[PDB]
Design an enzyme around this catalytic site. Structure first.
Site, PDB file in Angstrom:
ATOM      1  CB  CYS B  53      17.437  76.414  -1.268  1.00 26.83           C
ATOM      2  SG  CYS B  53      17.061  77.983  -0.281  1.00 26.83           S
ATOM      3  CB  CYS B  70      21.224  71.749   6.931  1.00 28.94           C
ATOM      4  SG  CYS B  70      22.381  73.116   6.826  1.00 28.94           S
ATOM      5  CB  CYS B  72      23.233  69.105   1.934  1.00 29.53           C
ATOM      6  SG  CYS B  72      24.037  70.543   1.180  1.00 29.53           S
ATOM      7  CB  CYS B  81      25.836  76.478   0.814  1.00 34.88           C
ATOM      8  SG  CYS B  81      24.346  76.944   1.788  1.00 34.88           S
TER       9      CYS B  81
END
Ligand code: SF4
Lengths: 102, 112
Positions: B53, B70, B72, B81
């Site tokens: 994303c 991830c 992160c 997130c």
């Protein structure tokens, strides 16, 4: 669609332009596609909506320093007048657009 | 498409990490499922589950830096997130599930 065609769209539009900078495998981005499509219909006479696949047109994503996806930028007269990231409801989206307008 | 093996790995990871971080999946498990497939696709492409994303100037380079693999750094630091994979329970989009089944992923990403 291209870096140049997008820039020309922004410079020529007679309405504010809401741009959704998206990616295919981003869950929030996919979630916003049908919501944005509903809002685009509700606001058909007030704004033009454009969706930019940041993975296919990274030059555009770099110009606007896109970070989290989706990013939405609202342009007035070719100029960004508001910007936000992430998912939001249809009501929030309509309210944010109508805000930045006034 | 991401391989099924990568998807299953990332699905089980997501359930384990949600439990370990006290976070919950989105009420719309189609968000959860797309993110898990995006993580799996990046793992297959680059060798680590780079966040799906986010826009990157250079995904391969960023995998090497590690910040956005991830989970992160923002998620590890403050449970932030952007993918809406791991939501804190006060988040408007959070449900109460820390389970995402293979069938949920298959049903919500079938057209992809
Ligand atoms: S925002 Fe971070 S924790 Fe959430 S899916 Fe992307 S990489 Fe994982």
């Amino acid at each position: 669609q291209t870096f140049d065609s997008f820039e020309d769209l922004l410079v020529n539009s007679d309405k504010p332009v809401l741009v959704d900078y998206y990616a295919t495998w981003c869950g929030p981005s996919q979630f916003m596609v049908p919501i944005l499509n509903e809002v685009s219909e509700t606001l058909k006479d007030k704004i033009q909506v454009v969706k930019i696949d940041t993975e296919k047109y990274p030059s555009i994503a770099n110009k606007y320093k896109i970070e989290a996806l989706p990013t939405f930028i609202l342009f007035k007269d070719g100029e960004p007048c508001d910007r936000f990231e992430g998912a939001l409801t249809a009501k929030q989206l309509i309210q944010r657009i109508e805000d930045s307008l006034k | 498409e991401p391989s099924e093996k990568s998807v299953e790995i990332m699905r089980k990871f997501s359930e384990q990490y949600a439990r370990r971080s006290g976070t919950y999946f989105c009420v719309d498990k189609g968000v959860t499922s797309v993110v898990i497939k995006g993580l799996a696709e990046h793992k297959d492409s680059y060798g680590a589950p780079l966040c799906p994303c986010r826009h990157y100037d250079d995904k391969a380079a960023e995998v090497g830096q590690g910040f956005w693999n991830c989970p992160c750094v923002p998620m590890r630091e403050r449970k932030e997130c952007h993918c809406m994979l791991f939501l804190t329970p006060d988040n408007d989009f959070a449900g109460k599930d820390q389970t995402i089944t293979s069938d949920e992923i298959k049903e919500t990403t079938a057209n992809m």
